[PDB]
Amino acid sequence: MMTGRQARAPLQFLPDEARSLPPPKLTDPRLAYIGFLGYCSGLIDNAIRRRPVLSAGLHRQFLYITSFVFVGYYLLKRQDYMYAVRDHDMFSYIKSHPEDFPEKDKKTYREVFEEFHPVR
Amino acid sequence: RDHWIHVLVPVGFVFGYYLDRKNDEKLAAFRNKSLLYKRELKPQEEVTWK
Amino acid sequence: MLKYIIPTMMLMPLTWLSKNSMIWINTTLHSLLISLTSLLLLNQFGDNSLNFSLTFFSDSLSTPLLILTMWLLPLMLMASQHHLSKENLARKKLFISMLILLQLFLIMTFTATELIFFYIMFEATLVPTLIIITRWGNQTERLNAGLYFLFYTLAGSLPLLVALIYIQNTMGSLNFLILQYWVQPMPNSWSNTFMWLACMMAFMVKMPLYGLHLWLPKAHVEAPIAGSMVLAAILLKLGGYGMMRITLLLNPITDFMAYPFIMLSLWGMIMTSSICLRQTDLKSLIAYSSVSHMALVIVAILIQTPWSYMGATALMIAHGLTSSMLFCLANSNYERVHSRTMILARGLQTLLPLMAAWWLLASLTNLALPPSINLIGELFVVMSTFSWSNITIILMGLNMVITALYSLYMLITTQRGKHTHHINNILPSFTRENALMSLHMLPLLLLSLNPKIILGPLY
Amino acid sequence: LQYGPLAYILGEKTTKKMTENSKLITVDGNICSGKSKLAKEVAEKLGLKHFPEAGIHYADSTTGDGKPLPVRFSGNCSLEKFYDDPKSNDGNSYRLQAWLYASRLLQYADALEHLLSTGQGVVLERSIYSDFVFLEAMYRQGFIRKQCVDHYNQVKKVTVCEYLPPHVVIYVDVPVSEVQSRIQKKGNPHEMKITSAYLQDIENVYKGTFLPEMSEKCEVLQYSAWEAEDAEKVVEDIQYLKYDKGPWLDQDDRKLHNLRMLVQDKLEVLNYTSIPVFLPEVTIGAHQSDRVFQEFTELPGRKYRAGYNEDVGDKWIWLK
Amino acid sequence: KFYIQEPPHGSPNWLKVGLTLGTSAFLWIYLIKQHNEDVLEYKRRNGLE
Amino acid sequence: MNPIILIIILMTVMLGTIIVMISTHWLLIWIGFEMNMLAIIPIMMKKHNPRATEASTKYFLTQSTASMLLMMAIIINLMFSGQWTVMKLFNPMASMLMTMALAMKLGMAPFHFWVPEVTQGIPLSSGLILLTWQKLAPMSVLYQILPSINLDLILTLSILSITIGGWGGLNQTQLRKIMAYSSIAHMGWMTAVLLYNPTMTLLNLIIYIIMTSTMFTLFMANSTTTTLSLSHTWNKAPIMTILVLITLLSMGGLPPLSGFMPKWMIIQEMTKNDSIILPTLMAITALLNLYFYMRLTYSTALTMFPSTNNMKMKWQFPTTKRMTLLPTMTVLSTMLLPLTPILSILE
Amino acid sequence: AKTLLHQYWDIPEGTECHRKTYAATSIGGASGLVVSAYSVALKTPTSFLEGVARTGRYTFTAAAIGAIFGLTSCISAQVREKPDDPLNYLIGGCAGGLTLGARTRSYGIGAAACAYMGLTAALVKMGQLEGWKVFAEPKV
Amino acid sequence: TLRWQEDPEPEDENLYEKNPDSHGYDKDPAVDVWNMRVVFFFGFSIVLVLGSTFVAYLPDYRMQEWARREAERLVKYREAHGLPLMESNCFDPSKIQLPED
Amino acid sequence: ARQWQPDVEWAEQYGGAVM
Ligand SMILES: CCCCCCCCCCCCCCCCCC(=O)OC[C@H](COP(=O)([O-])OCC[N+](C)(C)C)OC(=O)CCCCCCCCCCCCCCCCC
Ligand SMILES: CCCCCCCCCCCCCCCCCC(=O)OC[C@H](COP(=O)([O-])OCC[N+](C)(C)C)OC(=O)CCCCCCCCCCCCCCCCC
Ligand SMILES: CCCCCCCCCCCCCCCCCC(=O)OC[C@H](COP(=O)(O)OCCN)OC(=O)CCCCCCCCCCCCCCCCC
Ligand SMILES: Nc1ncnc2c1ncn2[C@@H]1O[C@H](COP(=O)(O)O)[C@@H](O)[C@H]1O
């Protein structure tokens, strides 16, 4: 779909145009949910190896949460960039082709006619 | 505390109320602009509601 | 709606960090506290709904269902703690966790402003109930009951997903507040006919319609008591809420596409009540009574008049409370005698007098004794169907006669007559069972004093 | 893990630690053949590690504190009840035989792991290759059914095929009459219930089924009762053997590395003992299995993994 | 001692514990630094300073 | 098998897949395909029993036929275009031959007859390698040539794959054959949505890879290859029963699990192009996959099948298998639906 | 198979019974030939005679189903003077299902085939009238 | 032959045997009496009573009383000036353009 | 009186070569 956009500068996670965008906050709800995913994976890792789930290996669970937060932050940056590119291309194409996107003649309800179907 | 398990849930309700208030402040784009409730601001206040 | 979601998910660490003997006390206490908290949704206005956010809103239709769900959860916790007495602790916590998760999905379902979010929660409700039925059910055929229930729901609901996505692509939004103002007439064609079928069949299966009801006397029977309570009291009303929300887009094609299901549901309640007259199983009898009452709600929604809508929502709430109480009473009999046969244990009024009084009150509310809200809902639906056509009064009168017949047949068979000679383990009623019965009865009787809070968004 | 592909890449070759004294020796005989003290005196002459004969509670000795567990957690079977009532209705005989075969398989895996990891020889008593003799005797006495023999043959077929036979098999010939005299002299009140037909069947299946099939894949030394007491002659015979038979000769580093990887995973060793073949003797119901498993979990030192048991005195759990 | 055989996890692998904690601290400070320079460049490019 | 030789062979498999992915020349695509197949043959024959050699023979014959068809399509395209750039094709015959060659390599119906036998004859790890990694390269080649693909042919292959996979998996009791028929149905879905939005195809491929990896990793963790041996797991490790229950529920596409997201977005994409009958038919057919998944969950997690006596001997020992990434793919295959808008990173 | 469908749908409905019946019979015979080819490929017969008998049986059954459906639908369109109506195709589909039951010689499969193939033929008629697309071209 | 090894069905436990003062909540008497107190207090004394008090004093639920007061005002105003109390058309016909036919 | 759990016949049905 957007390979022509991602064809002149290939294999780039975040192009230089992405730095003009606001970065996600560290209190992002998606980032917090990804950290919760990391915590859940740490608890499952404790559970499948017959360790005490909430007590054994706090360093392991901390590294799980940290790794999930890191990877999720970069994925969120890429996602926001790509939706920004989508909107930018959409608006540029709308503005460049005014013949195909005419202004709809809006009419008030005193002129329009709607059939009435009684419920009896 | 020896009864923290009895205060897990009410602080959850308080936190949910606080998040509700924060989002209500976030949705304040039409405050004092509606055609039904538009009015001049009484002095010693800045907004109609919080 | 986050002030109710967050304590519900905080119930999970409460049940997973409690002691080995304090899980029931903690979960019941804090669920009752959140149930008390749920009364703040009654800030309803005569013109506008209570719109919280972009994703959540609650008008006067979803509010009684929410209050019913959040009140029903501690009842299921109190009911389900006797047959799980000897269970492993981790399995007990898993059972309570499935109940909590089901309540979370249910309170996210009734408040969903977007229709696809409503669909996602409405089909997320399938997994905890299927797991509860097929794991903690007592019989052999609980697996077959789970298969029937799951596949009826999914076969009904996949075209609903396709049709909802089509509506999203065609209209531009699935937001219910937008669709109230952006709605368009749906003309008569084959495409719109299959649109109506796709949008309606999921909720016709879930309600259930007569002919699609074959999963109900299985899932309602092989489930445990808490599963039966949540299936009869809330899960049948997801279909009613769905038809109330989705009928807005299906006009004016409903006025002739609703004829076959009106004939199915008008004749269906006679068939299910007659089935109730000749039932050897108590739980199956209660399930078929649920089928008949939901057929009444189906007719009320399909004729789409204001009186019918008010009667439909009142009847939904009343039948939820009554069916939950009846299932609890049948479960108490099952714990006493270890059999579901109605003819086995007889004459229990000479042994269990206050339980017999609870049985009498539940039977009286089942046959719509005025001025209970059962009778208010049934009466309003009867008035609206009389306005629809006049021979509907013949059908409704026949249904009322058979309903009184089978309710009093239930009561006379179980409670009256000579007691069974060889059964000698009829223990006196516990305080827990009596408290459960009274917590089912007293809100039902109190709601007759102020019945205006259960009469829907067009009261 | 302690051993893996990374260690084998980094120069851990098992042929380097394999000297000429690293042999696997299995001692066999009848019930009171006196092979026990012969195995002991052989093991303390060439300096090999002695593994005593595996019983019901061998796996209890290997794991945990090493103390024997109750009989409802290990075995669910009684040897004394087999001696008193061999034709019991609950199928104690085949259940005991299957449990003992699994214990012998575990002991063989432990012996092979010690041999391959330390390069030291191991003396065994009645390995898995000489376990079917008791099953055949029990079948010929009518104690067990044909289905038990078929189940045993299936389990043996899928388990013994991936292990190496002993280097030397030592058999001690004691007649059934002398065996009976020894068991009445011993004083065990249940061992006097053994009939002469059972011992005769054991001797017949040792002589006519075991030794002809094991002399091809390994080396068999056979002694009488009185000449078995001279352990110097036996150690001289073992030191003067010409090892040229069996699959131990064509063993390179890769094959022994795969074998060592197999024998150090005990759950992979005992994978095929509990195959879903539903026999009335060994199938346990769901409620009984759940009750026994929940009882077993509550034992001291058994709830979690080995290093993560607080109630038995383990520290630094939060850093482990 | 309780066990007849020393468990492989009888004592914590202090090398692995140190590596885990060091990697986690390094990842957290790297993420904080990256976020700080990202918001700085955003405010520089947009002129929101 | 030597550890070093195994390492070299596995990197040769990944090198062949990389060579297919990164190259702009048709001959290099062909070279990468043969390098991948030649290197993956000894992974199938790790155990050296007659079943593995039979599976390897059938796999070799099928892949060689598909490779010769691919070379035929490439040569026809060179004859009618005079170039070798991996892009849209300049002949309908070359497009048809290449599409059927890639269908034979993917194992979609009616070329599906080799997948369950080959998966049954090989170990669990090699079957995981096959059903997960071997499908990255043909889908990439399909992703490069979509302007030349016939719509009727690819849609026929898709619906045939879905129906045949569901009906085939209805009857199996071995776990590897169930996984093979599940794979066939999922590739039917993936190539169904291919011509409308290939990003949905990439998302479905990623989700199916994660779910299959989780299920196979649980299978080798418990060392179970049949239905009943899997049913014995409740008396050994109940956490694994919970994990296989949630993963098999997510494999059936039940909301709110992460397996609902691919078919949800596929149905969303297909209705934008005014195709309503096919997404309904594919959902109704995927109910069969849900059926045999639910049968597995009945036999494993929601009931307690009778166990045997030696399970106590198995109780006394802990597991020591390297269950690599098992919690991560267990979490990522069940609780990923709230992060559905993450699919924009794949465009 | 593309020209068979066009030559079936080129004839106006309720106009030429013989040509519509012939087109439907040709389509049915082609489908039966495909089914028989796959049957003799995957499930090999005992001899040449058994295989050719199976081929003739399958082809004749499918051709009879097609002929009966086409004749019944065209006759019902002629009588009722309603050419564009899925009820005629429902009647023809039930007639084809009853023919399938007659060929297999069992009543229950015939009744089930009547209901299901009558519904399917009605759906095909609605799709032809409303322009539903099954293999829809990519558009967005 | 004899079937698989399985425990028999356990006898049902009478809760009134060891504890004649049981409320049926738990086998330990202290946990049982505390569960009874919790359910009876937080169910009846808190939720039912204060819930009924809350519902009874709802601040003009769905504007019914306001509608009655406004109807009184409008009826008085229209009756005083001789106006009709209600018209057949909700919207003014002057501001409505009918379709030309 | 207690919960029903599958017998030998249930698993034996489930354990064939084909279903
Ligand atoms: C529980 C069991 C019973 C379940 C019953 C479920 C409902 C029954 C009917 C479902 C039809 C399929 C979904 C239709 C969605 C229509 C959305 C839409 O836009 O429609 C207009 C569109 C119109 O096409 P369009 O919108 O692309 O075109 C633009 C509009 N025109 C035509 C004017 C140019 O309808 C269709 O595309 C076709 C609709 C009919 C589909 C017929 C095939 C399915 C037949 C029924 C299958 C039922 C389940 C079977 C399996 C049961 C279990 C084994
Ligand atoms: C609501 C939807 C969910 C349903 C399930 C809910 C479950 C959770 C339950 C939460 C708590 C309960 C909520 C509902 C409460 C309903 C009751 C309520 O609040 O009512 C308010 C109503 C409000 O009445 P009102 O609206 O007329 O009052 C006017 C309003 N104020 C007070 C502001 C002036 O209360 C009453 O009606 C009380 C009246 C006085 C007490 C009764 C006197 C008569 C009693 C009978 C006398 C004898 C008669 C003859 C008998 C013969 C023998 C039978
Ligand atoms: C647009 C997309 C572009 C491409 C994106 C990236 C795609 C990644 C695809 C991953 C494919 C994984 C293939 C299978 C595993 C490969 C490694 C291997 O060889 O594992 C088998 C190996 C065999 O060793 P052995 O000891 O014989 O095992 C038998 C059991 N004793 O070892 C074992 O059996 C050890 C036991 C554990 C094995 C765990 C393997 C997990 C691999 C999958 C991880 C999750 C998927 C990748 C991440 C997400 C990608 C989307
Ligand atoms: N399969 C078996 N069944 C019963 N008892 C056995 C079995 N195998 C070994 N034994 C025991 O092994 C003893 C002989 O070993 P030992 O006393 O060391 O020579 C016998 O007295 C039995 O108690």
Helix/strand/coil (H/E/C) assignment for every residue in chain G: CHHHHHHHHCCCCCCCHHHHHHHHHHHHHHHHHHHHHHHHHHCCCCCHHHHHHHHHHHHHHHHHHHHHHHHHHHHHHHHHCCCCCHHHHHHHHHHHHHHHHHHHCCHHHHHHHHHHHHHHHHHHHHHHHHCCCCCCCCCC
Which amino acid belongs to residue F102? L
CA distance D116 to D23: 11
CA distance A59 to E20: 6
H/E element, F178: helix F175-192
Q: Give the DSSP letter of residue H98.
A: P
Query: Would residue A56 count as lying in a domain?
Result: yes
**Nearest of C177, C53, C38, C112 to residue B22 by alpha carbon:** C53
CA distance C380 to C385: 9
C-alpha of residue F337 to centroid of ligand 4, in Å: 60
Experimental method: cryo-EM
Count of domains for chain A? 1
**Contact residues, chain F, for C123 at CB < 8 Å:** 254-255
CB pairs under 8 A between D and H: 26
**C-alpha distances out from residue I11 to D287, F57, F290, Å:** 15, 34, 21
CA distance D221 to D240: 12
Note the resolution in Å, 1 decimal.
Answer: 3.2
- Nearest-atom number in ligand 4 for the CA of D100 is 1
The 10 Å Cβ neighbour count of residue A23 is: 21
Give the torsion sign (CA, C186, C190, C193, C194): negative
Contact indicator for F300, F245 with CB cutoff of 8 Å: yes
Query: Would residue A37 count as lying in a domain?
Result: yes
Q: Helices in C236-352 by DSSP H: which ranges? A: 237-246, 254-257, 259-277, 282-303, 306-337
Per-residue tokens: E3: 């066990």
Which residue is associated with the tokens 């892949």? F63
CA distance D142 to C50: 82
Give every CB contact of residue D13 below 8 A, 6+ residues apart in sequence. D253
Instruction: Note whether H46 contacts C36, CB cutoff 8 Å.
Output: yes
Residues in a beta bridge with D222: D171
State in Å, rounded, how far the first CA of chain C is from the last one. 23
Residue B10 Cα to chain centre, angstroms: 18
Listed by start position, the domains of chain D span: 1-320
Contact indicator for F209, F132 with CB cutoff of 8 Å: yes
Strands (E), chain D: 24-28, 49-50, 122-125, 168-172, 219-223, 283-284
Per-residue tokens: H52: 């009924």
Q: How many residues belong to chain G?
A: 140
The 10 Å Cβ neighbour count of residue C389 is: 12
Instruction: Determine the distance in angstroms separating the CA of H63 from the nearest CA of chain A, rounded to an integer.
Output: 26
- What interhelical angle do F277-300 and C142-171 show, nearest 10? 150
Per-residue tokens: B38: 């538009």
Determine the Cα angle at D46 with ends D45 and D51, to 5°.
90
**Nearest of A63, A49, A57, A37 to residue F328 by alpha carbon:** A37
**Contact residues, chain C, for I3 at CB < 8 Å:** 136-138
Which residue is associated with the tokens 């009452």? C293
Per-residue tokens: C22: 């304090």
Interface of D with A in 268-307 (CB under 8 A): 304-305
Closest residue to B9, CB basis, from C7, C18, C53: C7
By the 10 Å C-beta count (0-12 exposed, 13-18 middle, 19+ buried), B2 is classed as exposed
Listed by start position, the domains of chain B span: 1-50
Question: What domain range includes position A81?
Answer: 1-97
- Best residue of H97, H100, H101 to probe chain A, by most A CBs closer than 10 Å: H97
Residue F140 Cα to chain centre, angstroms: 14
F125 lines ligand 3 (CB under 6 A): yes
Half-sphere exposure of H66 (CA within 13 A, CB side): 8
Contact indicator for C36, H47 with CB cutoff of 8 Å: yes
- For C330, list phi and psi in degrees, rounded to 5: -65, -35
**Nearest of D21, D38, D22, D24 to residue D171 by alpha carbon:** D38
Contact indicator for C440, C324 with CB cutoff of 8 Å: yes
**C-alpha distances out from residue C194 to C161, C248, F139, G32, Å:** 13, 16, 35, 31
H/E element, E24: helix E14-46
Task: Kindly tell me whether chain H and chain C come into contact, counting contact as 3+ Cβ pairs under 8 Å.
Answer: yes
Q: Which ligand is nearest to the CA of C67?
A: 2
- What interhelical angle do C306-337 and C237-246 show, nearest 10? 170
CA distance G76 to G54: 33
**Nearest of C214, C178, C212, C182 to residue C197 by alpha carbon:** C212
CA distance D45 to F116: 57
Q: CA dihedral in degrees (G1, G7, G9, G12; nearest 10)?
A: -170
Residues in a beta bridge with H5: D284
Half-sphere exposure of C38 (CA within 13 A, CB side): 28
Residues of D11-47 as b/e, b for ≥16 C-beta within 10 angstroms?
ebebeeeeeeebbbbbbbbbbbbbbbebbbbbbebee
CA distance D42 to D50: 9
Contact indicator for F130, F62 with CB cutoff of 8 Å: no
CA distance E28 to E36: 12
CA distance F184 to F163: 9
Interface of A with H in 59-118 (CB under 8 A): 110-111, 113
Give every CB contact of residue G134 below 8 A, 6+ residues apart in sequence. F275, F277, F278, G127
Which residue is associated with the tokens 């890769």? D254
- Best residue of E2, E14, E15 to probe chain D, by most D CBs closer than 10 Å: E2
CA distance H17 to H34: 20
CA distance C207 to C201: 10
Ligand 3: residue of F46, F47, F128 to mutate (most ligand atoms within 8 A of CB) is: F128
Contact indicator for H25, C432 with CB cutoff of 8 Å: yes
Query: Would residue A36 count as lying in a domain?
Result: yes
Strands (E), chain F: 307-308
Question: What domain range includes position C50?
Answer: 1-459
CA distance G1 to G13: 20
**Nearest of D86, D184, D104 to residue D144 by alpha carbon:** D86
Contact indicator for C419, C425 with CB cutoff of 8 Å: no
CA distance H32 to H25: 5
Residue A47 Cα to chain centre, angstroms: 32
H/E element, C50: strand C50-51
CA distance F151 to F156: 8
Instruction: Note whether H95 contacts A110, CB cutoff 8 Å.
Output: yes
- Cα radius of gyration rounded to whole Å, chain E: 22
State in Å, rounded, how far the first CA of chain E is from the last one. 65
Q: Give the DSSP letter of residue F85.
A: B
